[PDB]
Write a protein that binds this ligand. Structure first.
Ligand code: CL
Ligand code: CL
Ligand code: CL
Ligand code: MG
Ligand code: MG
Ligand code: MG
Ligand code: NA
Ligand code: NA
Ligand code: NA
Lengths: 172, 172, 172
């Protein structure tokens, strides 16, 4: 599928993000089943909120949940499902499931794709509304099964550290 | 594609439904061409009505038209195209084309995915509006070529019977 | 992917068009990377305008940019991403990038799919609004990299000539 996409053209500040779910999609949590390579519904989330940004992952990375590193990509409008955006990390939302670490990175489009985010260097350069919504969305991002907690934010450096760790984890 | 998805985790009341077309999609009738594995437009339907629910099929089933068993899945909001919903049958709309039987099952999300439909056991537990719309939509679900009739509804048991028959038909 | 789809059932007036981007999609320019077979974002376009029609290509054709022949397909409503529409050419918008020729064909659904466009034989049979929008959209259809110009329109015959040339180019 996306295996032949590098994690980026110049890591960790220049990455490729495969988009699973476009911005403003309904509050539905999915997962890619590695065994069948199909997208499954996990949860119809108990929130009126919709996806605050486009949602997917960096190809050829490995996070602590066995899945590729998660990324939200802020764009002017929702992109096509399944498309790939060359991107630049600007921050990270820290999450722990009861199974471990579970970071959600924030990225903007690469300067080659648009001039609009060129001076967005940190996540705090984005509207406070968007950051609020992002936090509140993932506070409800979990399955029904009894047995997720949203901590704080990390900066651009912390996001780049997450990527480097995630890339090293995959090649290992 | 979806061949490695079982027809369900516990048949026939616990099924997997691959979604071709999300709820509220334009009135366009498609078919999967088995020979090329691509989705083709068959008809721009002569109705203002839009898809009343998500529309797809159960993998590894065989209906009397050579295609997998058709299913509509009622959800809070439209799902992503191509995603898979673990589901529970609640009824069936009976249709005959001039080529034979052509049932359209009604299913809700599995209890693992949402609490909202837990007490929806029969299709008649759903709003009468939705059932009207479903009937009126498929009354227009046909190609232009000269040479479809919508009868009535069957209950949850009848839907489960359709699934068991469809699963038996595939393994044969 | 779409390699097993013929360029049409009866060339050049009866073609098959694989749709990448539905009508009314956000102003985002994509390309299919032949090496990875994935859809990439090229540009978030500097226009408020959205896709004026469905956008894709004819399988098994070869244009002067190494990509299959581009086509816009006018429909009542946006189609599903990735679906295939049997279509009929009615005109062409001429474009030159700084790299050569770059025609954008205009097609309507085949008579088998809908009665609505049966008497639309030329692109000038379509609303002048739509033609204006089409022209203005592609005036902004380009990457940011320094180094596209929209000329005029050709008729149905000229579009069919583009197809025949494109089909001959592929078999060569
Ligand atoms: Cl720009
Ligand atoms: Cl719930
Ligand atoms: Cl019609
Ligand atoms: Mg993920
Ligand atoms: Mg079907
Ligand atoms: Mg193209
Ligand atoms: Na994850
Ligand atoms: Na069928
Ligand atoms: Na082109």
């Amino acid at each position: 599928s996306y295996s032949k996409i590098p994690a980026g053209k110049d890591l960790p500040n220049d990455i490729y993000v495969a988009i699973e779910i476009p911005a403003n999609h309904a509050p539905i949590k999915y997962e890619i089943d590695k065994d069948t390579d199909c997208l499954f519904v996990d949860r119809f989330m108990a929130t009126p909120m919709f996806y605050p940004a486009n949602y997917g992952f960096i190809p050829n990375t490995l996070a602590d949940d066995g899945d590729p590193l998660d990324v939200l990509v802020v764009t002017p409008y929702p992109v096509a499902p399944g498309s790939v955006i060359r991107a630049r990390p600007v921050g990270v939302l820290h999450m722990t499931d009861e199974a471990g670490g579970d970071a959600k990175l924030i990225a903007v489009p690469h300067d080659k794709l648009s001039v609009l985010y060129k001076d967005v260097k940190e996540y705090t350069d984005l509207p406070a509304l968007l950051l609020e919504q992002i936090k509140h969305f993932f506070e409800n991002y979990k399955d029904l099964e009894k047995g997720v907690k949203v901590e704080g934010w990390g900066n651009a450096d912390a996001a780049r550290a997450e990527i480097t760790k995630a890339v090293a984890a995959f090649q290992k």
